[PDB]
Design a protein that fits this description.
2 copies of one chain form a homodimer.
Chain A (H helix, E strand, L loop, with lengths): L2 H16 L7 E5 L4 H12 L8 E8 L5 H16 L3 E5 L2 H7 L4 H19 L4 E3 L4 H14 L3 H5 L4 E2 L2 E2 L7 H10 L15 H17 L3 H30 E2 L2 E2 L1 H4 L4 H12 L4 H8 L7 E3 L3 E5 L2 E2 L2
Helix pairs in contact in A: 1-8, 2-8, 4-5, 6-9, 10-12, 12-13
Protein name (chains A, B): tRNA(Ile)-lysidine synthase
Catalytic activity (chains A, B): cytidine(34) in tRNA(Ile2) + L-lysine + ATP = lysidine(34) in tRNA(Ile2) + AMP + diphosphate + H(+)
Subcellular location (chains A, B): Cytoplasm
């Protein structure tokens, strides 16, 4: 069990558990140039036949943030040539966009980068986008929702497969990725992504997580188990909320005399769906109309018409 | 809304909702002497009739850990005397007990203290014990579970009503406990309870939470909404699980053909209660039997035979 097979085993296990690839023929990689990116690529090129892929291409986005950006682009191009892959390069001033839209560098960078990735996907005929997102990114994302406000969804964080996007390194942790690259003698760059990181995420990455790991050395392995438990529990809650939904709904209304007799958890789930809103505040405000007539406005109206309810 | 009504409204909301008190007539307060204790007591004296309580008494435990122990105990006796309340006092050499049983001062302290409280509950005829555990304590516990590994049942932390123990301040924030004390002129003394706090818990209390608050200064309020949401989802899971348990559990084995088709989330809950030991790796190991399996071992054994066993 060396650094290489440790990653490959987790990638293959993800495929068996989620069917990341199941018909796609042309994959576009979100290639920033960092270790994550390089290892993802080295892995996909190694398992290309295994997944029945016909084309794996790179897409590098130049954020114009710093001089190293040009250095990054050059590395990406040379990397494409050494690997004999096609590469698509894009460019947009992220810092500028962030300022005229009163948003952070992280969300501006994310927005422009994927806009670019998605444009190449359509004008070049790709079936999906492979991202180097991993277990440590998931842990950081989970902790950021715990901190800012969340329910089961935020805690579980992003999924391995998500409409057009694929995250093959989902089970792999940052350190295993670094050990993979060193072991195989790969080369990488400190891509511009490191300089867009939001302050909240840096606090969690370089201050909170290190402290938590001093309590539990294998935080990532432990966290992954929580995610798996949470995802099965969420799946169950969703399946049940759905049965009750198509059992209490009729037209554009909800049978209040039926819903009210159900478990609190399902009452909220049914309501979340019926009104397309996750806000803890809006859900409960609407939920109260299950016990006392009245109306609720969110930009749409919910009236209690004896036993029924519209919106 | 002043500092008093801010705490009382949260306590009232807890009662009218979960019935923390529903028949108990005599309550024993775990009175350390610090703000938490002092405020808990003041709140229970104000709501004593509302809760239909006949008597509220104090119980103070001297840990003999600091030369201020006697002054502290005296303060507690005078606290009771002034409000015409009964107070029970305990005293144990926690250091000696810790060395004797090879345990830390923290776990030794907590052990002896609760033994003391429970001894009084029985020999004096009290119905329940009221503790000053609040929202910040829950937040701490929640992060500890996130860190050491858990699922849904741990992210919650503890409950407001836990057999014999009641926690009226469940939803109250520490800062609200302190403002209440100031506003009402409540004086307090050193809280020996803080000598029962372990290293990991101190790290989360003094290092992690303060950092997370530099992201969301309203963390506690945010965490509250999450608890209320998860809390209900857990109740529903626990509910559906127990239900399934009786249907599959028959004698001392599990109807595999039937359990095998239930949702993954419920399978884990049933197994957790069947094999007593609830640990991700144990449960998953056993759950592998349901679908074409041989036999597994741990502290006991189990065999798949169209039905199920346990030897």
């Amino acid at each position: 069990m060396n650094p290489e097979s440790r990653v490959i085993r987790k990638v293959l296990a993800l495929q068996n558990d989620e069917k990341i690839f199941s018909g796609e023929r042309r994959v576009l990689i979100a290639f920033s140039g960092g270790v994550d990116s390089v290892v993802l690529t080295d892995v996909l090129l190694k398992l290309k036949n295994y997944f029945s892929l016909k084309e794996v291409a790179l897409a590098h986005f130049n954020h114009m943030l710093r001089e190293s950006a040009e250095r990054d682009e050059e590395f990406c191009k040379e990397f494409a040539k050494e690997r004999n892959m096609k590469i698509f390069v894009g460019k947009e001033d992220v810092r500028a966009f962030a300022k005229e839209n009163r948003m952070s560098l992280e969300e501006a960078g994310r927005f422009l980068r994927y806009k670019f990735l998605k444009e190449i996907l359509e004008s070049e005929g790709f079936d999906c986008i492979a991202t180097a997102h991993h277990l440590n990114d998931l842990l950081e994302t989970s902790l950021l929702f715990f901190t800012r406000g969340t329910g089961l969804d935020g805690l579980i964080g992003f999924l391995p497969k998500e409409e057009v996007i694929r995250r093959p390194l989902y089970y792999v942790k940052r350190s295993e990725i670094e050990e993979y690259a060193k072991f195989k003698g790969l080369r990488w760059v400190e891509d511009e992504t490191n300089y867009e990181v939001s302050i909240p995420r840096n606090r969690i990455r370089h201050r909170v997580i290190p402290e938590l790991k001093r309590i539990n050395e294998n935080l990532e392995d432990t966290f992954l188990k929580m995610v798996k438990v949470l995802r099965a529990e969420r799946e169950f809650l969703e399946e049940e909320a759905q049965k009750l939904y198509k059992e209490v709904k009729k037209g554009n209304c909800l049978d209040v005399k039926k819903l009210k007799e159900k478990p609190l958890a399902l009452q909220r789930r049914v309501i979340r769906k019926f009104i397309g809103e996750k806000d803890y505040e809006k859900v409960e405000l609407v939920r109260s109309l299950l016990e006392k007539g009245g109306e609720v406005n969110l930009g749409k109206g919910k009236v209690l018409k004896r036993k029924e309810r519209w919106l």
